[PDB]
A paper describes a structure:
G protein-coupled receptors (GPCRs) convert extracellular signals to intracellular responses, primarily by stimulating guanine nucleotide exchange on heterotrimeric G-protein Gα subunits. Gα·GDP can then re-assemble a heterotrimer with Gβγ or, in the case of the Gαi/o subfamily, engage [name] motif proteins that are also selective for the inactive Gα state.
However, unlike the G42V mutant of Gα subunits, the [name] mutant retains normal GTP hydrolysis kinetics. Positioning of Gln-204 for hydrolysis may be possible if the Arg-42 side chain adopts an alternate rotamer. We also crystallized Gαi1([name])·GDP in complex with the [name] motif from [name] and derived an independent structural model at 2.8 Å resolution. In one of the two monomers of the asymmetric unit, Arg-42 adopts such an alternative rotamer that would allow Gln-204 to orient the nucleophilic water for hydrolysis. The structural model of Gαi1([name])·GDP bound to the [name] motif of [name] has provided a snapshot of an alternative Arg-42 rotamer that would indeed allow Gln-204 to access the orientation necessary for GTP hydrolysis. However, this rotamer still is expected to perturb the activated conformation of switch 3. Gα([name]) mutants do not engage the active state-selective peptide KB-1753 nor RGS domains with high affinity, but instead favor interaction with Gβγ and [name] motifs in any nucleotide state. Our crystal structure models of Gαi1([name]) indicates that this perturbed conformational flexibility is likely due to steric hindrance and electrostatic repulsion between the mutant Arg-42 side chain and residues of the switch regions.
Author numbering:
A (entry chain A): 30 to 347
B (entry chain C): 496 to 510, 513 to 530
């Protein structure tokens, strides 16, 4: 028994919340058994196809041509072969089509401009390992399951023990929940782990939003750690997708997100800046004390270390 | 208010066509084809 710690995950869609939870089951539990991994074989195939299709459609809306005029048919084949195949079924022809498309320079050119439209951050992952996924005897690795994207049916909760502590990690994902359910999450919460997708800094905003995921996150985070009702609740910042951010900061300047930024386009100086933008939203220099972390939710080794650090901080506060 | 907060939470964390299994809706050939 000893002590029980309640954790609550916040953060905009696609910020890595579900991933963190799935990490806990891998790190501080028995992970996924060979059998459990076989269950996701279907969704893995799906997400793969769903990704390539997402890019192909983008090529039409962005008016991008194929590097090879021959791929045109393959694009058509894709939807047909995908309209005709099923779950737990990966034809060598379909994989071949997806593969050739994933190689096309035009498709790549579109993939590079994935900031101008909505695309999942598991696309490149699967599309790269296509040859392995396509295999008949293929069984989703533990890292594969980690990358899967399924329909979040309501509120998820995971139990696990670590350093003589009983953790209960809650995550409300996508599911629009009533005022009632939310209260039961904020109640007794030892700490809130707020997740921010660093790579969202350069994304072109949607046609229905008034700002952008980054600023939306800032507006959310603001109300959170500034709400008097959370005074005793410890705030933990997870600046996530640091790896993708690093690759983006090379060609996409931080000025696109923060115009008043006069620093160099380096991962180190930009990330430090973003952190400050969030931490400066805390109108309590004395009271509140934000615990920031630059994480890669898909990197187990990382998450493990980060969470270990978080743990200590919680034990210390006694 | 807390309602405002809950409202914000709902719209910010609100989910698209790249989750779960395939659907006959995601398989519609784009117009330029
Ligand atoms: N490269 C990279 N990908 C990530 C990271 N965190 C999440 N992702 C990917 O982003 C996708 C969606 O993240 P998810 O956890 O479902 O977002 P959320 O549940 O709405 O908070 C997942 O399929 C992950 O593969 C990261 O730190 N680095």
């Amino acid at each position: 028994g000893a002590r029980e710690v309640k954790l609550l995950l916040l953060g905009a869609r696609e910020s890595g919340k579900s991933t963190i939870v799935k990490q806990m089951k891998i790190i501080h539990e028995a992970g996924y058994s060979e059998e459990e991994c076989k269950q996701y074989k279907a969704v893995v195939y799906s997400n793969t196809i769903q990704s390539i299709i997402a890019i192909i459609r983008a090529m039409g809306r962005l008016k991008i041509d194929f590097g090879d005029s021959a791929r045109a048919d393959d694009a058509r084949q894709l939807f047909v072969l995908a309209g005709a195949a099923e779950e737990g079924f990966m034809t060598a022809e379909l994989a071949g089509v997806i593969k050739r498309l994933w190689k096309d320079s035009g498709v790549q050119a579109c993939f590079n401009r994935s900031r101008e439209y909505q695309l999942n951050d598991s696309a490149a992952y699967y599309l790269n390992d296509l040859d392995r996924i396509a295999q008949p005897n293929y069984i989703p690795t533990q890292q594969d399951v980690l990358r899967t994207r399924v329909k979040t049916t309501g509120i998820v909760e995971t139990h696990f023990t670590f350093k003589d502590l009983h953790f209960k990690m809650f995550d409300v994902g996508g599911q629009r929940s009533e005022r009632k359910k939310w209260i039961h999450c904020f109640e007794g919460v030892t700490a809130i782990i707020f997740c921010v997708a660093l790579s969202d800094y350069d994304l072109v905003l949607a046609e229905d939003e008034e700002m952008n995921r980054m600023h939306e996150s800032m507006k959310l985070f603001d109300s959170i750690c500034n709400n008097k009702w959370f005074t005793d609740t410890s705030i933990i910042l997870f600046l996530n997708k640091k790896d993708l951010f690093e690759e983006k900061i090379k060609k996409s300047p931080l000025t696109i997100c923060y115009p008043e930024y006069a620093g160099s386009n380096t991962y180190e100086e930009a990330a430090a800046y973003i952190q400050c933008q969030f931490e400066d939203l805390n109108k309590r220099k004395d009271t509140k004390e934000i615990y920031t972390h630059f994480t890669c939710a898909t990197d187990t080794k990382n998450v493990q270390f980060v969470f270990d650090a978080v743990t200590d901080v919680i034990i210390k506060n006694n | 208010d807390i309602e405002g907060l809950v409202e914000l939470l709902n719209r910010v964390q609100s989910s698209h066509d790249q989750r779960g299994l395939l659907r006959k809706e995601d398989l519609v050939l784009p117009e330029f084809l």
